[PDB]
Ligand binder design. Structure first.
Ligand SMILES: C=C1/C(=C\C=C2/CCC[C@]3(C)[C@@H]([C@H](C)CCCC(C)(C)O)C[C@H](OC)[C@@H]23)C[C@@H](O)C[C@@H]1O
Length: 253
């Protein structure tokens, strides 16, 4: 029964463009990480101590700061994104920034030891570094289920960039104006994604895969709300702002 329309010229172009954008804004060598404030790991095998030292916060806050910059850059090259008013571009970036960081980071997440391996022991990031940045297990552990859940999809890079683009261009975000444009843009991306999956993804018995990807967008919303909860409390720490960046302040404040 399953019809399998071919990717259209436009759709193939969309994928090309998104692949090129990701390649321009996601360095797979991580050769910039050494420019961040150094990571510090001082023994904590304590919430009080966490908040007292915040040893990993300057380094991780720089990594998130750097990644938001990469994401803004990635957004600009999503076809259609420029046609939105800049006010709406900003709503979408601010609200998706942490979700996209969560998707993109999957390129460094390894199931070998359940860490984000960007090195080089110093830029290997584990659960325990996240807690050393002042967050708790209630965000960290689902973030790790999410990462694993996502590795096991074995996404083609075509789908991976399409999923970040769909994520960013979501019409149902607090404060959007032209929800209809965003939907129109998002729909251009989803249809491309649905078409690709049924042309280029084997077996296939997976009409399943699209649904699983859409569910990942939904897990992301929960994590986002929990990140935000925990950021709000993190910022109650005196002189915490110095350990952040102006951009992390604005995006999450
Ligand atoms: C960010 C990336 C990378 C790893 C991401 C990571 C690993 C370290 C902790 C992070 C950063 C979370 C914490 C909870 C964020 C804390 C932020 C703050 C202190 C402001 O509250 C968000 C996130 O999810 C994977 C985490 C490496 C590479 O794959 C590029 C990608 O761009």
């Amino acid at each position: 029964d399953s019809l399998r329309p071919k990717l259209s010229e436009e759709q193939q172009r969309i994928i090309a463009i998104l692949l090129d954008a990701h390649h321009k804004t996601y360095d797979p060598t991580y050769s910039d990480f050494c420019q961040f404030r150094p990571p510090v790991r001082v023994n904590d095998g304590s919430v009080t101590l966490e908040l007292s030292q915040l040893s990993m916060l300057p380094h991780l806050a720089d990594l998130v700061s750097y990644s938001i910059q990469k994401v803004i850059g990635f957004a600009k090259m999503i076809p259609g994104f420029r046609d939105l008013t800049s006010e709406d571009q900003i709503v979408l970036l601010k609200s998706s920034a942490i979700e996209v960081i969560m998707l993109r980071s999957n390129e460094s997440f390894t199931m070998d030891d359940m860490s984000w391996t960007c090195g080089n022991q110093d830029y290997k990031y584990r659960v325990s570094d996240v807690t050393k940045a002042g967050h708790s297990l209630e965000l960290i552990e689902p973030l790790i289920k999410f990462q694993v859940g996502l590795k096991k999809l074995n996404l083609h890079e075509e789908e991976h960039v399409l999923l970040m683009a769909i994520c960013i261009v979501s019409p149902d975000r607090p404060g959007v104006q032209d929800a209809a444009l965003i939907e129109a843009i998002q729909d251009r991306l989803s249809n491309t994604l649905q078409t690709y999956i049924r042309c280029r993804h084997p077996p296939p018995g997976s009409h399943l895969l699209y649904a699983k990807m859409i569910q990942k967008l939904a897990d992301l919303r929960s994590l986002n709300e929990e990140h935000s909860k925990q950021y709000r409390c993190l910022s109650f720490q005196p002189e915490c702002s110095m350990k952040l960046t102006p951009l992390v302040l604005e995006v999450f404040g």
